[PDB]
Amino acid sequence: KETAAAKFERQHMDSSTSAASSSNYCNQMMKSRNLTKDRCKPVNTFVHESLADVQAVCSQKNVACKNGQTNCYQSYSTMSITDCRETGSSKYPNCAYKTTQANKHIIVACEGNPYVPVHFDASV
Amino acid sequence: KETAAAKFERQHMDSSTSAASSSNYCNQMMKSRNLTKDRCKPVNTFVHESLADVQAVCSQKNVACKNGQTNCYQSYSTMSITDCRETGSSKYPNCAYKTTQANKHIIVACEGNPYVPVHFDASV
Ligand SMILES: O[C@@H]1CO[C@@H]2OCC[C@@H]21
Ligand SMILES: O[C@@H]1CO[C@@H]2OCC[C@@H]21
Ligand SMILES: O[C@@H]1CO[C@@H]2OCC[C@@H]21
Ligand SMILES: O[C@@H]1CO[C@@H]2OCC[C@@H]21
Ligand SMILES: O[C@@H]1CO[C@@H]2OCC[C@@H]21
Ligand SMILES: O[C@@H]1CO[C@@H]2OCC[C@@H]21
Ligand SMILES: O[C@@H]1CO[C@@H]2OCC[C@@H]21
Ligand SMILES: O[C@@H]1CO[C@@H]2OCC[C@@H]21
Ligand SMILES: O[C@@H]1CO[C@@H]2OCC[C@@H]21
Ligand SMILES: O[C@@H]1CO[C@@H]2OCC[C@@H]21
Ligand SMILES: O[C@@H]1CO[C@@H]2OCC[C@@H]21
Ligand SMILES: O[C@@H]1CO[C@@H]2OCC[C@@H]21
Ligand SMILES: O[C@@H]1CO[C@@H]2OCC[C@@H]21
Ligand SMILES: O[C@@H]1CO[C@@H]2OCC[C@@H]21
Ligand SMILES: O[C@@H]1CO[C@@H]2OCC[C@@H]21
Ligand SMILES: O[C@@H]1CO[C@@H]2OCC[C@@H]21
Ligand SMILES: O[C@@H]1CO[C@@H]2OCC[C@@H]21
Ligand SMILES: O[C@@H]1CO[C@@H]2OCC[C@@H]21
Numbered sequence: 001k002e003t004a005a006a007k008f009e010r011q012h013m014d015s016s017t018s019a020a021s022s023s024n025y026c027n028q029m030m031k032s033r034n035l036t037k038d039r040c041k042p043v044n045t046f047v048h049e050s051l052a053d054v055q056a057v058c059s060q061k062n063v064a065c066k067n068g069q070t071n072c073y074q075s076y077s078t079m080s081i082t083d084c085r086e087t088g089s090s091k092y093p094n095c096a097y098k099t100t101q102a103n104k105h106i107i108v109a110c111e112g113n114p115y116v117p118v119h120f121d122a123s124v
Numbered sequence: 125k126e127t128a129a130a131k132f133e134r135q136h137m138d139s140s141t142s143a144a145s146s147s148n149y150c151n152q153m154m155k156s157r158n159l160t161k162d163r164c165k166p167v168n169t170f171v172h173e174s175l176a177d178v179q180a181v182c183s184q185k186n187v188a189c190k191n192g193q194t195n196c197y198q199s200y201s202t203m204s205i206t207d208c209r210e211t212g213s214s215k216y217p218n219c220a221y222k223t224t225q226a227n228k229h230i231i232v233a234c235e236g237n238p239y240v241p242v243h244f245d246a247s248v
Contacts, residue, residue: 006136042188043246063222064166064210074209074222083229083248085198087187098187100248105224107209122167122246124207124224 004111004118011035012120013054014046019044019080019086021099026084026097039084040095045120046081054117058110065109072105072121081106081123128242134243135159137178143204143225150208150221163218164210167246171230172204178241182234189233189245191210194246198231205230205247210236 002010006027010033020026035041047054064073083100090096102123109119126134134157144150159165171178182198189196207224214220226247233243 039235040188042192043190061222062212064164064214066167067164074224083246088186098185100198100229102228102248104228104248117229122207123245124225124228 004060004088005116008117008119011044012047012049012117013051014082016049019048020046020082020099024096025082026062026099027095030084030095030097031036036093036095038089040092042086044084045106045123046082046084048082053108057108058115058117059113063107064077065107065119067110069109071111072107072109073080074124075105077105078103083123126159126240129240132232132241132243135168136171136241137175138172139174141172144170144171144206147223149206150223151219153206153221154208156202160217160219164214164216166210168208169230169247170206170208171173172206175223177203177238178230178232181230181232182239182241187231189231189243192239193233195235196231196233199229199231207247 056071060072060076063072063074084097088093089100106123107121108117110120181197184200186200187198208221210234211222228247230247231245235242
């Protein structure tokens with residue numbers, strides 16, 4: 001199995017590009033990151049910043065997670081992100097995603113020692 | 125009990141202002157909209173557009189909800205919104221919220237006849 005931290009990296013980190021390259025970005029990334037393997041993951045966000053910048057969020061603004069847990073953190077600054085969301089004719093195993101690029105604060109849940117992101121809660 | 129539609133209006137509609145008026149906007153609105161009555165609701169978004177503009181989202185871009193349901197819709201345009209999130213010393217019944225104003229697409233789940241918003245899924 002993956003560690004929680006490694007799974008966060010796989011699902012949510014894209015430090016290789018400053019933003020989505022095209023309207024097919026999500027189709028490509030959801031597939032290559034193994035998020036369409038056993039089902040179509042309905043919604044997923046990729047962050048276009050360094051791993052260090054995203055891990056740093058765990059020592060930024062402490063806020064409540066959507067479920068009421070206390071280990072969530074909101075980035076002080078906005079970050080380049082891409083929201084990927086299933087759309088239209090999407091039906092496993094023929095997944096299809098809408099790509100929406102934006103610049104927003106991210107909110108992540110952190111755990112462990114070292115204290116690192118393990119869930120993407122939301123973006124604002 | 126409230127209808128689902130009326131509950132959405134109570135939790136999520138603020139057509140009276142173009143944006144959050146101050147850093148205390150969320151403290152005021154979470155209280156006056158009864159979201160701190162029996163507990164501190166951890167996270168909640170208010171939309172600063174007409175009720176008609178928000179209801180109109182139900183006939184815009186059909187996308188998957190975070191849970192995989194198919195009745196979610198993403199606004200074609202961005203809208204003025206305020207994210208309210210519990211912060212710091214927040215402990216029922218002394219709720220405390222961080223106010224973050226932004227301009228984003230909204231995603232809502234719709235139901236019924238007439239087909240209207242019943243849940244706020246996310247914003248991008
Ligand atoms: O390293 C960071 C991660 O993504 C940004 O755009 C390209 C490089 C920048
Ligand atoms: O808007 C985002 C922020 O930085 C990226 O470079 C091109 C656009 C991307
Ligand atoms: O097309 C836009 C412009 O720059 C971004 O980096 C990858 C492609 C994005
Ligand atoms: O960054 C966004 C994502 O895809 C669009 O087409 C290229 C740039 C636009
Ligand atoms: O374009 C890419 C290539 O393969 C992905 O699955 C469908 C289309 C996606
Ligand atoms: O699919 C997208 C398109 O550009 C990114 O770099 C590698 C693949 C990524
Ligand atoms: O918080 C983590 C710990 O190491 C990274 O470099 C700076 C911040 C990142
Ligand atoms: O409530 C506080 C907020 O962050 C600390 O670490 C986890 C919970 C502790
Ligand atoms: O975390 C979820 C995934 O997509 C949504 O956009 C903002 C955050 C929401
Ligand atoms: O009616 C709409 C709802 O909120 C906007 O700013 C004030 C009026 C506008
Ligand atoms: O940014 C939002 C969009 O419209 C509002 O008027 C003042 C700022 C508010
Ligand atoms: O202060 C800003 C400027 O205009 C917005 O409408 C209410 C207050 C907001
Ligand atoms: O709109 C945002 C929300 O609160 C800030 O102070 C007033 C305007 C700023
Ligand atoms: O400022 C307002 C007034 O009452 C709310 O609960 C705490 C503070 C909030
Ligand atoms: O609390 C906020 C401050 O301004 C809005 O109009 C009525 C109260 C709302
Ligand atoms: O979709 C709903 C139905 O009535 C409202 O006025 C236009 C759109 C709104
Ligand atoms: O799958 C489609 C998408 O919208 C229709 O109404 C509910 C589900 C139907
Ligand atoms: O719906 C939730 C509530 O707050 C988050 O900001 C974007 C949407 C997320």
